[model samples]
Target: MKLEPEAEAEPLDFVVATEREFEEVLAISGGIYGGLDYLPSRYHSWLRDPDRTVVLAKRNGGVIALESVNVIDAGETVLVEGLRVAPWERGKGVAGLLQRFCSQLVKRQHPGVKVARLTRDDQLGPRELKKYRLITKQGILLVRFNASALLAGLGARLAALRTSGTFSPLPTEAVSEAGGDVARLLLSPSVQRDVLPGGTIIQDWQPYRPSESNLRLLAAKGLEWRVDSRARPRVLTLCTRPFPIPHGGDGTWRYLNIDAFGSDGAQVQSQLLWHLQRQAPRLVGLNVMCQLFLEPQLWSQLADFCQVGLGLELVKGYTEQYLLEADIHH
Candidate 1:
């Protein structure tokens, strides 16, 4: 859709603000589809970080889009977080305009940012993907996962642990240790897991104190758990967000992102999936999306969960992905 630039208001006149306007748009649009709301905590953490830039799009006296640009000084990459144009105004060039505006804004404010990245699903449509790639200069990475198969794998593991009495609790230190361990497991050659064609493991540490917002959101949904049986406790992170695209209708949930980490790879991964299945009734119609780099054993356990392998290719130096959800009006 072609949108004429507002003759009266320059792009600079588009007010950019923080959480106040960001949350306002989310409340109005429910959330940005295939963008930042996919993982709410990522956006929350970005807002708290000094290197991140969060901006809002306004037109004709109404908030219409929200754009979050994250600059990693060490990595020298700029991530486009939640970029959403109000649903009603989507066909117009609002999204395109905001995209160019944010890109230029970052170049001027953080000249060090060399690359920008974002993630979208198959449902984004070929046309949308073409536009997204043209705007970002990046290609699409396809990733998939099955929920039912993974649940079965978890059940088997839990059953075996029950019989062998090897299911010990994980200690608090395990959470930190698990984060590092899982990160390493992804890179292990013998794991038999799939990795994006050229993607390598990047940040592996657990989210810091400031990331509590993301953690709390997971905890509220009973997806975050602690392993306290061992000497050092470890954390197992299994989380998911409902995809609001293609099926924008309310009351349906699809595609969850699951992350499992702990010293006891089998047990931890199994327990995490088990927890997700037990909670499935509460989240009926929900599926999952896990990266290919997960350990082979973990993937095996998740096999029955209706999973698919996505040929994910991470831009050489990109780190974590960022997203934002906003509301827009005409």
Candidate 2:
């Protein structure tokens, strides 16, 4: 008589994540990104995103891991984000299993998706290097502060920069305009080589090639894009609207992220100031964790500007955010 296979070799239950699994996923995500995890803030919208997929791995009907993939770059690329494995499942290769599962699922659904991309903070070894080619990297500068206080104090800070003669606020053009000059600048070969890293635009944590379709994708997210000069760009920055996070004082704390691309300290700092100026007033009476992703060599100078020039609390020292990509095959 035939017998059922042993339960010990049973496959993990893979399911599309839903609102019902939120708490379980949160339970296993403690200390993620040293308290800067975006999943808790983006989970609901991720579920609603038509081009995104949030997958969960289950064992015995319990959620063990979660990973998400969003189709971007005109469906030629998938950006993987929000990967987490339960604490108990850390050493058992559950993360790899979940990742492979999601990749196959995404490729099957979007046959045009030829590449997978992700941004990571952790160190990568030789094994990982073989699979993911390094596209670019940025230095992560984290700062925590009270919003209203900074808002009140910000004017003087900008004045100080102007008074110093060594720094000044550069002219900025918002990319939201109908005939936006920034879009054309982004596609320029000089801007691609001089401003963007490896000719790639890493917005927040996702990297996209500087294409018209990709620019439209970014604009659709309501991201605020500011540039020093459209005709001859020295720096460009992108800021996501502040979002609430599960942190501090009944979870009222908000997280703000700004991605700065350029080598000049003054231009980069000016763009960062512009983003904060637009965002800080709206966040009054709230705590904020403001993170700046910028050129690696500029980290020390920029960190000082945020801490001393702006009087913000430095949350952490230098950390690197690596942009990685790999080919997806059926």
Candidate 3:
């Protein structure tokens, strides 16, 4: 993942976007995910930092494409998001050029960068992404709800939560203290193999440990983890505030991405799911939302709940989150 560039890396003006330039680039690529030009101010502390940056590729000041590299798990992984190319920029090698540049930037600037990853929409298919030499075979559990119904069910859900003695909410501070445990959960060798999969495009020993920074970043977005600590801990949900998802047709509606989860294979999430959705808006506020990313090492109970399928759980055309990597040894 060093300065060793990609094949046919083209020469172009690549700038670590200034706020002004970043806004302009967003304007140019706004059609993407209904591409919102504004990033919430709260997230900028990390999302827009120099170490966590959005890069723009330009030819004579004309926007070609833009992508972002964010430090997660304390600089252990570089998550690339918002990779967009202009209408005329296709059929050109601009995608490769930008990706190759970002990879090298990781090596030079972030010596701690162990992997280079990105998320893409399945609608674009593996063919377009395969151009970057990335392999694919992972899919997520996408879920949707009627925000109005979600709000209406609030009363019944909380009553059920209090009566249910099997699952209980731990203090959020407990999660902060469990940083090492959380880190181990993500970095555990066996879990790594299962979650990352053998079909991964990159090399072996791909380590993406969740650092304290990872937890803190979650706090920024008002997200937290809930687990059942009876005997061994079973992580139930990792969720965020339910704000309007202003993208595609899901706009003006609320949603939550169970970004991370684990269960001891003993309980049903139907009640728990209701429990989570009912309160996230009430307790955390109702103006924020997330595109949830589901993993293979998921809850055992989801088998029953997720039967709601694509009609109720329509996957976003641009919503598949990919955890890609380059040279894994580093």
Measured against the true structure, the TM-scores of the candidates, in listed sequence, are 0.49, 0.91, 0.63
What is the alpha-carbon lDDT of model 2 when measured against the actual structure? 0.85
- Encode model 1's per-residue lDDT on 31-66: one tens digit a residue: 444332443435455567666777778866668887
Instruction: Identify the leading candidate in terms of TM-score.
Output: 2
lDDT of 3 by residue, 1-330 (tens): 579855434458888766555455545554554423233222234344645777789887766778778766566677776677877778777888898888878777788877666544455556655544344423354455544454566555546655666334333323432454444444445444443333221211112344445444444545455444322443334554444443554344454544443433333243245445555555332332334343344422343334331113444432334444554233
Instruction: Tell me the spans in candidate 1 whose CA falls farther than 4 Å from its real position.
Output: 1-12, 31-45, 73-75, 123-175, 178-197, 201-256, 260-330
Alpha-carbon error at 68 in model 2, in Å? Answer: 0.9
Candidate 3 lowest-lDDT run of ten: 199-208
lDDT of each: 0.44, 0.85, 0.49
Order the candidates by lDDT, highest first — what do you get? 2, 3, 1
- Please provide the root mean square deviation of candidate 3 (C-alpha atoms, Å): 7.5
lDDT of 1 at 308: 21
Q: Tell me the TM-score of model 1.
A: 0.49
